[PDB]
Amino acid sequence: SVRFDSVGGLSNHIAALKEMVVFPLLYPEVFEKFKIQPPRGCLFYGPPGTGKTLVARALANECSQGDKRVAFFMRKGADCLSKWVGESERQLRLLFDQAYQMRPSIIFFDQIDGLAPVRSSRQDQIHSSIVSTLLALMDGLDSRGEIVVIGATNRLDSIDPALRRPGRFDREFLFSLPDKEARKEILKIHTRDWNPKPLDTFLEELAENCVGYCGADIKSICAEAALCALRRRYPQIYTTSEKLQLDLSSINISAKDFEVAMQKMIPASQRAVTSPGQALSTVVKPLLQNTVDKILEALQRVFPHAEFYQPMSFRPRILIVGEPGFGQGSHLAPAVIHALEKFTVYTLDIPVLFGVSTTSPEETCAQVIREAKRTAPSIVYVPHIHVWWEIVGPTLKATFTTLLQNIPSFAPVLLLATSDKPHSALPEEVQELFIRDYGEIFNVQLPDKEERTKFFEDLILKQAAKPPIHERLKNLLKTVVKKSQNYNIFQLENLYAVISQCIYRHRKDHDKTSLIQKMEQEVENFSCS
Amino acid sequence: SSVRFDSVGGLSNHIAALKEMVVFPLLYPEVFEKFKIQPPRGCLFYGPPGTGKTLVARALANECSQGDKRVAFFMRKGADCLSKWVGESERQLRLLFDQAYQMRPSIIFFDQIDGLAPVRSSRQDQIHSSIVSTLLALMDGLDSRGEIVVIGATNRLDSIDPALRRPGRFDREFLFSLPDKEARKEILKIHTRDWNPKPLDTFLEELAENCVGYCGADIKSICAEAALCALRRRYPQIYTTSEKLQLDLSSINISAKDFEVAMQKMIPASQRAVTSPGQALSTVVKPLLQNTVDKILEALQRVFPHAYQPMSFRPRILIVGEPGFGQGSHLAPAVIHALEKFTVYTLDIPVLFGVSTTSPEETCAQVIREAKRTAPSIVYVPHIHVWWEIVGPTLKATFTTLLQNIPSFAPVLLLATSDKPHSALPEEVQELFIRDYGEIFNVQLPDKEERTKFFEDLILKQAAKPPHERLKNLLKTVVKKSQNYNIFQLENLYAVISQCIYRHRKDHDKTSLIQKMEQEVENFSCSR
Ligand SMILES: Nc1ncnc2c1ncn2[C@@H]1O[C@H](COP(=O)(O)OP(=O)(O)OP(=O)(O)O)[C@@H](O)[C@H]1O
Ligand SMILES: Nc1ncnc2c1ncn2[C@@H]1O[C@H](COP(=O)(O)OP(=O)(O)OP(=O)(O)O)[C@@H](O)[C@H]1O
């Protein structure tokens, strides 16, 4: 029994939808003033779990509380199929007759994509017949009354082109994944009636830590946490096999319960394809934070839409270049992509183009470019262009070059790429796409002495000098930081692991100085060049 | 239920040629028997979706139903005759025909006939073949059905059994194309007739040219969304209440900004699944290339006279220019958009390969055949100097052979753009253009006047907003310094200029951004 209250972050859509069916049943004077006859059709589409069905259910539950009373008809995917020849096209006719009898009413076709495909001469005739009769019913010789048709779909492009037209489906609503803000309202709604209400700061600090959670993940995590407290409180519940009596007044939920559930589950989005966004690990942050900030500020210079009448830009493009082993295409670009949320990102790389065996790669590229254009602004991600170029046939190169050229000049679509060879060493065809004079090239340099000092600061001496459950180590830190003053990233974290290995080697030694000499031997025995 | 040959607009030839079939034999019956004519009694409407077909049927039925001469009317859906029992699938058609004959004259209407009579084939069931057979043998066989007229409608004409399409069964076919400039104005006149504050005709005429690619139901939906937007602008407090309020029906007038918002929010029905290869100049870039567009149009008028009947012989043209001059991205789409009422067929890399499950040769043959069917038309091949190298010899031979078989005097234009000069283009391309005839156009950079007109609007008026001699100095310096830049450099400079105006929005005092504009002027250097 939800009535326009469990929804979160969707204000414009509900306003349009209540303009959609409620106004003619409430204010039948403005419409007759100019003979408007407002529209009677909608179409929902988007990634799963965004609240596609909850909106319809809330509408049906709310509007049934008349006056004015509103009926409802719900249908599954392909209920209108039978073995004989003359029933499938008759179920729709009798359904329309019944709905017209009790007008006004609402007819909701659930997942029309499995009912009305694109017309073709290759498949069976039954699909053509049913799509034809459905097409005739919506707008025939006689006009239908006060019926409203609603449809949902996961693949918008698979619908017959003759259905999308003023008269049948004249409005298309895009349901996207929730942004940073809406998660707060979702958490508030799902955790409303709790006696120990969590503070708004608690909810917000949970909010920035959940990226890629889509509607149902939030509901799942709220229920996967209240069970951790139950399991912790009364461990001896599984042993028995009979009814027990409990004490439900001291099982209040704590903050520490949320962390375990968060580490245990994964979002629905990052379940079938890896998401091309990862925040820096807690170990690498005090080594690359400043560089990442510099990259984003340069992007802000070149991409005005990254601020936080409209800004105007002209073909935003950026490229990151640096020596191999600098971690540019492995740690920097994912962090940059993750920092810029609320922007849909599409991946174009070797694993994806050849990762499907049913379609040509150029078809995939055209589809990706079209989808990027449709929902601008967006970021097109393509890593390691210096190897990416000399792998595909000339046809794909020409198609990619032309498709990008046809985008409107002021359309804010970003092109992000990374390379290992220097700019002058790249092939020319790449070269006349980056205009460094304009400020489209960013170079990478190794971190300074203070950053490297902070990198090893925590290990020595806080973890090594940690009691099992102090001056020579300064010289060890000095010699380590002076020795590693010309190391790339990979060598830097490689050296970090080997020391932690001998750190973990000595769990139960309460007497020190039995491994400090081992430490100073290991740091000098190790040699990389 | 109150439409009678008046709510229809823009269709005159079809309605004129239609009433001569179901009215003339009854109104003037003393002429046909002199020549024993038995005039044709078959029609089949077809066209792109949303062009207003069923409205014609509704108007005809409503007009003929009420009048001095009474004629019956029967209606059918797509495949509403099929029944589970074997003996009832085809018997319903016989009963319907008998009833129609018993009450002659009468009218039989099939809606979406393509869902009832597919082409006969051996790779499907038998009931469809049986229905097709009895239909084609029952309409005109050994009995001379007499005065019965059959009308069908569909969107896919090529999916009809050819045995049904020959005189005797389906006599005439009518083409329902998208409305042009004048028809859109007429349908606007039709759809806004009963408004108390009657809009001026000069407003509708101006608005008509803005709605390119629209057709029928799109116009009808716009005319309603406009009123909804007006109600939105007038009483924005209506959505935060679950109770009826008190409304005053005196301040609900319509303004132009409402139509602007509605047009911005909406997109046409035709180019929804794909994109048409035609776009007009944006307002920002417009005051730079109208002279070039007009010169190009004059060149076409010299070569293509369709812009006594005019005569032409294989019209061709080729726009060439240096890279960065903006000929393959700003000029050709403008020409295509300006020359409307000619159906377009694009042909380039993203279309030849972008769709799989077919061969390029099939696509190119189909495009040319279709363009020949709907002559006159336009064939567009952009970026020829690269398009000529990413195709195999087979496609080259097929294309070079196809355009030689078309009739010589048919008006089939071929349009293409090039970047390298015509001298450097390879062989077999230089012989397709006969520039001695005047088949080659050369572009050149815009001069000082339009350059100044481009920047004066931004740097004189927009630069000084309520929320001054040095402005002339900045304008003249900017114009002087950029007298050798191409289109891309000009738009980049425009954007980098506008960035400062954006970023200094909330400062009430000027002279803080004029300096910033200066350093932007000297610090910004192009590559050239
Ligand atoms: N704003 C929201 N508030 C509460 N629950 C939401 C919200 N958005 C999505 N949901 C969750 O999604 C469900 C309703 O939509 P649901 O996710 O079942 O449809 P969908 O998966 O998007 O569409 P389909 O299942 O057809 O692909 C509810 O069970 C609810 O937990
Ligand atoms: N020239 C016109 N004059 C008036 N109304 C028009 C015109 N063209 C289109 N329309 C409007 O557009 C609608 C088109 O409906 P109709 O079913 O007749 O077209 P259709 O192409 O047969 O539809 P579909 O393709 O969906 O079967 C009509 O209801 C009509 O009001």
Residue numbers in the entry:
A (entry chain B): 422 to 729, 786 to 946, 1330 to 1389
B (entry chain C): 421 to 727, 786 to 945, 1330 to 1390
Q: Which of the paper's sentences describe this entry?
A:
ATAD2 is a non-canonical ATP-dependent histone chaperone and a major cancer target. From a structural standpoint, ATAD2 exhibits a conserved multidomain architecture comprising an N-terminal acidic domain, two AAA+ ATPase domains, a bromodomain, C-terminal domain, and an exceptionally long C-terminal linker (CTL) that bridges the bromo- and C-terminal domain. Unlike most other histone chaperones that do not require ATP for activity, ATAD2 stands out due to the presence of an ATP-dependent AAA+ ATPase domain. The AAA+ domain adopts a conserved structural fold found in the AAA+ ATPase superfamily, with each monomer consisting of a large α/β nucleotide binding domain (NBD) and a small α -helical bundle domain (HBD).
While processing of the ATAD2 structure yielded only a single major 3D class, the ATAD2-H3/H4 complex could be classified into three major 3D classes with resolutions of 3.8 Å (Class I), 4.3 Å (Class II), and 4.3 Å (Class III). Class III was similar to Class I but displayed an extra handle-like density that connected to one side of the AAA1 ring. This additional density was also observed as a weak signal in the 2D class averages. Although the identity of the extra density could not be definitively determined due to insufficient resolution, based on parallels to Abo1 and the general size and shape of the density, one possibility is that it corresponds to an ATAD2 bromodomain. A notable feature common to all classes of the ATAD2-H3/H4K5Q complex was the presence of an extra globular density that was unobserved in the ATAD2 alone structure. This density was situated on the top surface of the AAA+ ring close to the central pore and connected to a density resembling the substrate peptide observed in the ATAD2 structure. However, together with the XL-MS data that indicates crosslinking of the H3 tail to the ATAD2 AAA1 pore loops and the connectivity of the globular extra density to the H3 tail, we favor the idea that the structure represents a single H3/H4 dimer docked close to the AAA+ ring by the H3 tail. Superimposing the AAA+ domains from ATAD2 and ATAD2-histone complexes revealed that in the ATAD2-histone complexes, the P1 and P6 subunits moved away from each other, thus widening the seam cleft, and opening the AAA+ ring. The changes were most prominent in the asymmetric Class II conformation with less prominent changes in Class III and I. Consistent with potential movement of the N-terminal LD upon H3/H4 binding, examination of ATAD2 intramolecular crosslinks showed that the N-terminal LD crosslinked extensively with the nucleotide binding pocket, pore loop 1, bromodomain, and C-terminal linker (CTL) domain in the absence of histone H3/H4, but lost most of these crosslinks upon histone H3/H4 binding. Together, these data support the idea that H3/H4 binding to the bromo- and CTL domain might allosterically release the N-terminal LD from the P1/P6 seam, open up the AAA+ ring, and prime the AAA+ ring for activation.
